[PDB]
Amino acid sequence: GSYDAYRTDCEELSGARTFRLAPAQWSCRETFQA
């Protein structure tokens, strides 16, 4: 994972989302705009 430490968030948002959908929906979408 961990594409220059940017998508290291976004791999939860790809899978772990089912048990997150807000506490982690706070980085991939805006730290680099997906």
Residue 11 corresponds to which tokens in the numbers above? 């791999």
Taking a C-beta distance cutoff of 8 angstroms, is the pair 8, 32 a contact?
no
AA letter at 16: A
The answer to whether 24 and 12 have CB atoms below 8 angstroms apart is yes
In this structure, which amino acid lies at residue 2? Answer: S
Cα torsion for 16, 18, 22, 23, to the nearest 10°? -40
Backbone φ and ψ for 29, nearest 5 degrees, come out as -60, -10
Tokens 């979408």 belong to 29
Amino acid of residue 30: E
